[PDB]
Design an enzyme around this catalytic site. Structure first.
Site, PDB file in Angstrom:
ATOM      1  N   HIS A  83      -9.997   2.088   5.763  1.00  0.00           N
ATOM      2  CA  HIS A  83     -11.314   2.036   5.138  1.00  0.00           C
ATOM      3  C   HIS A  83     -12.114   0.959   5.861  1.00  0.00           C
ATOM      4  O   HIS A  83     -11.654   0.369   6.854  1.00  0.00           O
ATOM      5  CB  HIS A  83     -11.295   1.793   3.619  1.00  0.00           C
ATOM      6  CG  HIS A  83     -10.729   0.483   3.205  1.00  0.00           C
ATOM      7  ND1 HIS A  83      -9.398   0.325   2.886  1.00  0.00           N
ATOM      8  CD2 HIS A  83     -11.322  -0.718   2.995  1.00  0.00           C
ATOM      9  CE1 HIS A  83      -9.204  -0.927   2.513  1.00  0.00           C
ATOM     10  NE2 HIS A  83     -10.344  -1.577   2.600  1.00  0.00           N
ATOM     11  N   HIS A  85     -13.498  -2.053   5.079  1.00  0.00           N
ATOM     12  CA  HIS A  85     -13.405  -3.523   4.939  1.00  0.00           C
ATOM     13  C   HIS A  85     -12.848  -4.209   6.171  1.00  0.00           C
ATOM     14  O   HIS A  85     -12.025  -3.650   6.931  1.00  0.00           O
ATOM     15  CB  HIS A  85     -12.502  -3.908   3.797  1.00  0.00           C
ATOM     16  CG  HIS A  85     -13.055  -3.603   2.450  1.00  0.00           C
ATOM     17  ND1 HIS A  85     -12.235  -3.264   1.398  1.00  0.00           N
ATOM     18  CD2 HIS A  85     -14.335  -3.536   1.996  1.00  0.00           C
ATOM     19  CE1 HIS A  85     -12.997  -2.970   0.349  1.00  0.00           C
ATOM     20  NE2 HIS A  85     -14.272  -3.168   0.672  1.00  0.00           N
ATOM     21  N   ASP A  87     -10.542  -6.384   6.513  1.00  0.00           N
ATOM     22  CA  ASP A  87      -9.103  -6.464   6.752  1.00  0.00           C
ATOM     23  C   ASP A  87      -8.555  -5.175   7.391  1.00  0.00           C
ATOM     24  O   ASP A  87      -7.370  -5.112   7.784  1.00  0.00           O
ATOM     25  CB  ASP A  87      -8.310  -6.783   5.473  1.00  0.00           C
ATOM     26  CG  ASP A  87      -8.607  -5.865   4.315  1.00  0.00           C
ATOM     27  OD1 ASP A  87      -9.721  -5.331   4.319  1.00  0.00           O
ATOM     28  OD2 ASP A  87      -7.767  -5.718   3.384  1.00  0.00           O
ATOM     29  N   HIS A 148      -9.667   2.292  -4.378  1.00  0.00           N
ATOM     30  CA  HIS A 148     -10.108   1.082  -3.701  1.00  0.00           C
ATOM     31  C   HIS A 148     -11.522   1.229  -3.171  1.00  0.00           C
ATOM     32  O   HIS A 148     -12.368   0.358  -3.385  1.00  0.00           O
ATOM     33  CB  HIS A 148      -9.163   0.709  -2.538  1.00  0.00           C
ATOM     34  CG  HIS A 148      -9.502  -0.613  -1.905  1.00  0.00           C
ATOM     35  ND1 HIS A 148      -9.505  -1.814  -2.610  1.00  0.00           N
ATOM     36  CD2 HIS A 148      -9.852  -0.924  -0.633  1.00  0.00           C
ATOM     37  CE1 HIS A 148      -9.860  -2.793  -1.791  1.00  0.00           C
ATOM     38  NE2 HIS A 148     -10.027  -2.288  -0.569  1.00  0.00           N
ATOM     39  N   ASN A 179     -10.452  -6.790  -4.779  1.00  0.00           N
ATOM     40  CA  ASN A 179     -11.875  -6.525  -4.602  1.00  0.00           C
ATOM     41  C   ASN A 179     -12.165  -5.177  -5.243  1.00  0.00           C
ATOM     42  O   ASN A 179     -11.480  -4.204  -4.936  1.00  0.00           O
ATOM     43  CB  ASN A 179     -12.223  -6.508  -3.123  1.00  0.00           C
ATOM     44  CG  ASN A 179     -13.701  -6.237  -2.850  1.00  0.00           C
ATOM     45  OD1 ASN A 179     -14.589  -6.437  -3.715  1.00  0.00           O
ATOM     46  ND2 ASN A 179     -13.988  -5.793  -1.615  1.00  0.00           N
TER      47      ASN A 179
END
Ligand SMILES: C=C(C[C@H]1O[B-](O)(O)c2ccc(Oc3ccc(OC)cc3)cc21)C(=O)O
Ligand SMILES: [Zn+2]
Length: 231
Positions: A83, A85, A87, A148, A179
């Site tokens: 995804h 993000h 990280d 998520h 998050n």
């Protein structure tokens, strides 16, 4: 034993062999005054490596290419970010400098672009609807619907019966949600449903942060998600 946040200094990467041809990689980063561990995956495909997700940071991602060279000595040729993000895509540029071809669903490439993160070069056609699945190197990329995030992909490795959740799957130890800014908590439990259906043979489940266990992480994740929402 799997490594934890206290055992790994920021800027160093560990590799953990889940199975033949299959490793997680574990890094640490300092994010909102806090220090977090982080997972990703490495899958062998011939004399070649597929990399699932960065090591969360340019510095950490150079470090992971080095530990891969030292410990595996095969070349990383592609990467999938699961995804948008940081990280999962932060370090994408180190990977591209290095010759890696970086992939992501086009949901991700856009969302990455808005957030101002790094953007994988190539699009994964074929996943834009729940339950969709596609083969990519030696794994299946499965899109379960929003959890998520709207774009999370999970990754299954049939050779080894290894399922990788990304941040859509919470480690067992986790009591509380992460998050949730970009999550949709009403579907999340149903998206974990789809996963449960598609991949019932899964012998290993690897959360996006923390320790891997079996398919219990799936219900445990939905547990956690429901608590958060009933509060
Ligand atoms: C463990 C986490 C948090 C940690 O993992 B993660 O994949 O959500 C993640 C994504 C991005 C992170 O950097 C940002 C987060 C929010 C943000 O907005 C201002 C900007 C940058 C940190 C994390 C989790 O399970 O969600
Ligand atoms: Zn995460």
């Amino acid at each position: 034993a799997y490594p934890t946040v206290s055992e790994i200094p920021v800027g160093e990467v560990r590799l953990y062999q889940i199975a033949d041809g299959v490793w997680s990689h574990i890094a640490t980063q300092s994010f909102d005054g806090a220090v977090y561990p982080s997972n990703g995956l490495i899958v062998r495909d011939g004399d070649e490596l597929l990399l699932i997700d960065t090591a969360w940071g340019a510095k950490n991602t150079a470090a992971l290419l080095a530990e891969i060279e030292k410990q595996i000595g095969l070349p990383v040729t592609r990467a999938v970010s699961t995804h948008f993000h940081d990280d999962r895509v932060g370090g994408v540029d180190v990977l591209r400098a290095a010759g890696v071809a970086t992939y992501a669903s086009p949901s991700t490439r856009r969302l990455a672009e808005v957030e101002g993160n790094e953007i994988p070069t190539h699009s994964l056609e074929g996943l834009s609807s729940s339950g969709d699945a596609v083969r990519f190197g030696p794994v299946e990329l499965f899109y379960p619907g929003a959890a998520h995030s709207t774009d999370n992909l999970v990754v299954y490795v049939p050779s080894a019966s290894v399922l990788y959740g990304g941040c859509a799957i919470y480690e067992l130890s986790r009591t509380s949600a992460g998050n949730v800014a970009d999550a949709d908590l009403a579907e999340w439990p149903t998206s974990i449903e789809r996963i449960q259906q598609h991949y019932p043979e899964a012998q290993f489940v690897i959360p996006g942060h923390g320790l891997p266990g079996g398919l219990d992480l799936l219900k445990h994740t939905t547990n956690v998600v429901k608590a958060h929402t009933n509060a």
